[PDB]
Design a protein around this ligand. Structure first.
Ligand SMILES: Nc1ncnc2c1ncn2[C@@H]1O[C@H](COP(=O)(O)OP(=O)(O)OP(=O)(O)O)[C@@H](O)[C@H]1O
Length: 185
């Protein structure tokens, strides 16, 4: 029992990774299938925009998220080979080894070390259980994810904010894929 009355509606989309990685139709598919499995108030407008395009309802498979209030969210979304089912426990930290392993005799010989247990155990899991790193929202995480922002998308962005609407970006596997304009209903 809580509020959800300030409803958002998706109003314009533009692409940035054109010809290089992902196209507009796969962009709206991966955002709409991610928000089909999330619990957010805003990105679910793209869930409908996708569901109404696909004419199917049966969209969204497993997600491994990291969420923030106001600043957007990040996750790993599968469907392409999700038939393995992943181990996801604390995995953004879950370390193979907090020590040397490329050439120990040249770099800090503390120990004997493990060389197969836990090492590769998460990488070979993901490389068979094929998956996709995606994030969406705000503007500061769009900076912090190692990306570059251009003066034309910024002139397009602040303009929707000047018009008093909701103005956000979408990133994928350390690339910028595109941007979204949204309004209130
Ligand atoms: N699924 C989501 N994906 C990305 N960003 C999201 C998501 N849900 C919310 N946001 C972020 O929320 C920000 C807007 O915050 P705002 O305070 O307007 O929302 P709200 O908290 O729902 O509003 P209200 O003040 O009515 O509670 C956007 O810039 C957007 O990035």
């Amino acid at each position: 029992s809580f509020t959800m009355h300030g409803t958002p509606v998706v109003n314009q989309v533009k692409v940035l990774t054109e010809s290089n990685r992902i196209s507009h139709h796969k962009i709206l598919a991966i955002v709409g299938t991610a928000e089909s499995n999330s619990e957010h108030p805003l990105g679910t407008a793209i869930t409908k925009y996708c569901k109404q395009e696909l004419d199917t309802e049966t969209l969204g498979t497993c997600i491994d998220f990291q969420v923030v209030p106001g600043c957007g969210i990040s996750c790993k979304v599968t469907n392409i080979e999700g038939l393995l089912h992943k181990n996801n426990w604390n995995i953004e930290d879950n370390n193979i080894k907090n020590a040397s392993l490329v050439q120990i005799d040249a770099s800090n010989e503390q120990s004997s070390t493990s060389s197969s247990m836990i090492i590769d155990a998460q990488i070979s899991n993901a490389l068979n259980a094929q998956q996709y790193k995606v994030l969406i929202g705000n503007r500061e995480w769009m900076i912090r994810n190692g990306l570059v922002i251009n003066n034309d998308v910024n002139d397009f962005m602040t303009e929707h904010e000047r018009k008093g609407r909701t103005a956000v970006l979408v990133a994928v596997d350390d690339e910028l894929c595109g941007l979204i304009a949204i309004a209130d209903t």
